[PDB]
Amino acid sequence: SGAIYVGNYRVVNRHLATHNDWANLVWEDSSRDLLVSSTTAQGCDTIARCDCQTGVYYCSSRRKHYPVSFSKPSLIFVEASEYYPARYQSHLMLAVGHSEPGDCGGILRCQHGVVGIVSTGGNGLVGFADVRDLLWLDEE
Numbered sequence: 776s777g778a779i780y781v782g783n784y785r786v787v788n789r790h791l792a793t794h795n796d797w798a799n800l801v802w803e804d805s806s807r808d809l810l811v812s813s814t815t816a817q818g819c820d821t822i823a824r825c826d827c828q829t830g831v832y833y834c835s836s837r838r839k840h841y842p843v844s845f846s847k848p849s850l851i852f853v854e855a856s857e858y859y860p861a862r863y864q865s866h867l868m869l870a871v872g873h874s875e876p877g878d879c880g881g882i883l884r885c886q887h888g889v890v891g892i893v894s895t896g897g898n899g900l901v902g903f904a905d906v907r908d909l910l911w912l913d914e915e
């Protein structure tokens with residue numbers, strides 16, 4: 776689990792969104808595994824607006840933050856799962872790192888701010904849903 780709290784927005788994995796998230800919906804995209812809902816309180820996270828390919832992510836199944844090198848956001852085939860049919864997921868970045876299903880939502884960050892959240896994994900890989908192109912998260 777986990778979310779990004781920027782401005783009056785809560786960014787979560789679409790597959791982990793709550794009923795309250797759907798009832799306060801701003802935007803969602805199944806092809807990216809992202810959903811954004813509105814919040815009453817202002818958050819403290821800042822979104823990175825950069826080209827970093829190195830950063831640090833939080834792994835809840837280890838209670839640890841790990842430094843990683845990650846690929847540029849791309850269209851990657853993601854196997855049918857209990858959350859989606861077999862499909863290509865867009866804006867996904869891969870790295871070598873430990874992950875388990877409940878690690879989704881952990882933040883990946885660089886020196887500029889939050890880069891994305893854990894969305895996929897297995898066999899010593901971890902995939903992150905990028906948010907750096909979502910410029911509207913910085914306004915309204």
Ligand SMILES: Cc1cccc(N2CCCN(CCC(N)=O)C2=O)c1
Nearest residue numbers: 808853856874875876894895896897
């Ligand atoms: C982090 C992690 C580790 C092990 C496994 C996973 N699973 C669990 C099942 C669903 N997906 C796919 C989600 C999607 N974005 O389509 C995973 O990759 C995640």
Ligand SMILES: [Zn+2]
Nearest residue numbers: 825827885887
């Ligand atoms: Zn950066």
